[PDB]
Amino acid sequence: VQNIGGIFIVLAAGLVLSVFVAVGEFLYKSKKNAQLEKRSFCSAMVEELRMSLKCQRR
Amino acid sequence: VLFVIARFSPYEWYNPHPCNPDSDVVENNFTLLNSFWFGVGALMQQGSELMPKALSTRIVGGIWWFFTLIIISSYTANLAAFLTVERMESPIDSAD
Amino acid sequence: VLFVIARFSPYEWYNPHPCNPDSDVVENNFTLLNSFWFGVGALMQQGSELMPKALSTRIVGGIWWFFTLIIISSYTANLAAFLTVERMESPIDSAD
Numbered sequence: 001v002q003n004i005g006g007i008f009i010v011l012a013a014g015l016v017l018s019v020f021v022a023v024g025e026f027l028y029k030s031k032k033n034a035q036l037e038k039r040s041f042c043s044a045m046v047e048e049l050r051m052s053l054k055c056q057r058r
Numbered sequence: 059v060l061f062v063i064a065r066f067s068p069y070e071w072y073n074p075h076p077c078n079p080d081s082d083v084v085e086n087n088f089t090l091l092n093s094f095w096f097g098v099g100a101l102m103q104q105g106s107e108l109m110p111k112a113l114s115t116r117i118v119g120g121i122w123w124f125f126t127l128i129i130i131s132s133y134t135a136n137l138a139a140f141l142t143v144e145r146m147e148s149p150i151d152s153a154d
Numbered sequence: 155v156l157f158v159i160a161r162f163s164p165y166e167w168y169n170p171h172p173c174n175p176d177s178d179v180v181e182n183n184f185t186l187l188n189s190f191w192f193g194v195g196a197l198m199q200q201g202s203e204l205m206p207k208a209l210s211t212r213i214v215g216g217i218w219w220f221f222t223l224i225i226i227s228s229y230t231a232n233l234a235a236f237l238t239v240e241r242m243e244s245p246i247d248s249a250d
């Protein structure tokens with residue numbers, strides 16, 4: 001571990017940097033579809049019902 | 059964590075449906091069986107039929123590729139050294 | 155072995171047909187000529203267009219990728235020694 005070492009560090013830091021893009025993809029979608037369909041905070045939780053489904057859907 | 063993001067990212071949900079997209083189609087190709095197959099398929103330098111969309115899953119695929127680029131490259135460096143046979147140790151090593 | 159498993163596995167049977175079959179167009183694209191090509195295509199580090207779908211054939215796809223990873227890596231690590239030819243070394247070098 002003492003002489004490879006850092007490729008696990010950038011792998012750990014890469015997955016940390018990825019999940020904030022995932023909420024960035026979530027909020028940019030949840031602000032876009034809520035212009036006409038639903039409201040601001042609720043339509044985020046509406047798509048939470050989509051993602052928590054254990055099945056295929058629309 | 060690729061499966062967690064690909065079941066949370068609202069851009070991986072894609073319609074295959076190539077003719078003319080109507081409604082009520084979209085579905086992830088990242089099942090939990092499939093996400094190991096991208097992890098193993100990239101680790102073995104061969105690549106999969108799975109290729110991510112949806113930038114949050116691209117970054118996981120981006121950093122796992124650079125992970126397995128170095129591990130395979132570090133493995134082939136020392137492998138020239140460790141392919142030398144060792145003769146058998148003698149069954150005695152001291153007066154005892 | 156991959157041809158035996160793909161005809162025996164009930165999940166490699168898929169209907170290709172991306173637009174609404176409605177009865178039966180289910181196919182099993184692994185023939186003999188396709189099964190050798192996945193083996194040769196992974197031996198030469200290039201990868202075919204055909205990818206295993208059932209987990210019955212993923213392990214065959216998984217182990218054979220790990221087999222051809224070590225073959226090519228042991229090939230490249232050893233061939234550095236054989237192209238860098240150690241020259242003629244007639245075992246007299248000085249008066250000592």
Ligand SMILES: CCCCCCCC/C=C/CCCCCCCC(=O)O[C@@H](COC(=O)CCCCCCCCCCCCCCC)COP(=O)([O-])OCC[N+](C)(C)C
Nearest residue numbers: 051052053054055056061062065086088089090091092094
């Ligand atoms: C190194 C090894 C370590 C262990 C491996 C890791 C663990 C092994 C993972 C095991 C489960 C993952 C395997 C693929 C899915 C199973 C499909 C199947 O069996 O046939 C099913 C076809 O119905 C479907 O195919 C529905 C598709 C479900 C979504 C697929 C990903 C979600 C799995 C999320 C997994 C958990 C993640 C957290 C939860 C979100 C038959 O349906 P069923 O049998 O009656 O099931 C109830 C029906 N229902 C689901 C439709 C309601």
Ligand SMILES: CCCCCCCC/C=C\CCCCCCCC(=O)O[C@@H](COC(=O)CCCCCCCCCCCCCCC)COP(=O)([O-])OCC[N+](C)(C)C
Nearest residue numbers: 002005008009010011012013014015016017059117120121
């Ligand atoms: C699944 C979620 C993760 C779960 C687990 C979470 C864990 C969190 C993990 C890691 C989180 C970060 C904390 C650790 C890193 C710094 C502290 C440290 O260890 O010092 C290190 C260096 O320190 C550096 O040199 C840091 C330089 C930046 C590299 C890290 C980010 C990569 C840059 C962007 C690229 C990626 C982003 C972009 C991708 C496109 C120690 O080095 P040293 O001390 O100098 O010498 C070694 C001596 N010793 C052996 C005794 C130690």
Ligand SMILES: CCCCCCCC/C=C\CCCCCCCC(=O)O[C@@H](COC(=O)CCCCCCCCCCCCCCC)COP(=O)([O-])OCC[N+](C)(C)C
Nearest residue numbers: 091094095096098099155209211212213214215216217220
């Ligand atoms: C026609 C076909 C051919 C015939 C049929 C074959 C039948 C028979 C063929 C072979 C069986 C018997 C072999 C004889 C020797 C046994 C080995 C042994 O001794 O123990 C070894 C254990 O090493 C292992 O455990 C190897 C297995 C690794 C696990 C693979 C899992 C991969 C799954 C992941 C896939 C992921 C998929 C990705 C997609 C999700 C170590 O011990 P040893 O050092 O070797 O012992 C030497 C003795 N000595 C100590 C004095 C030196």
Ligand SMILES: CCCCCCCC/C=C\CCCCCCCC(=O)O[C@@H](COC(=O)CCCCCCCCCCCCCCC)COP(=O)([O-])OCC[N+](C)(C)C
Nearest residue numbers: 098101102126129130133213215216217218219220221223
């Ligand atoms: C590059 C990324 C590839 C990732 C793959 C990683 C796979 C797991 C990796 C490593 C797992 C095991 C690590 C121990 C090996 C050390 C050597 C050894 O012990 O040999 C000894 C016996 O042989 C054994 O006892 C090993 C038994 C398992 C062999 C098969 C492992 C590969 C799994 C197959 C799956 C294929 C892949 C699955 C997916 C398709 C020989 O005796 P010795 O040497 O004199 O004793 C020294 C022991 N010491 C060094 C421990 C002190």
Ligand SMILES: CC(C)CCC[C@@H](C)[C@H]1CC[C@H]2[C@@H]3CC=C4C[C@@H](O)CC[C@]4(C)[C@H]3CC[C@]12C
Nearest residue numbers: 001002004005006007008009010011012013015
């Ligand atoms: C990346 C995640 C998902 C899986 C791997 C876990 C990582 C974060 C862990 C597992 C083993 C750990 C290493 C184990 C030993 C050492 C040596 C020590 O002197 C510095 C820390 C260091 C280098 C650790 C850094 C963090 C580490 C690489």
Ligand SMILES: CC(C)CCC[C@@H](C)[C@H]1CC[C@H]2[C@@H]3CC=C4C[C@@H](O)CC[C@]4(C)[C@H]3CC[C@]12C
Nearest residue numbers: 020021022023024025026028069111112113114
């Ligand atoms: C940290 C954040 C704010 C910066 C990155 C912005 C991310 C989250 C968003 C902003 C605009 C988004 C893009 C908008 C439109 C499309 C076209 C679609 O067919 C595929 C997804 C794609 C390509 C999106 C990917 C994600 C994206 C790039």
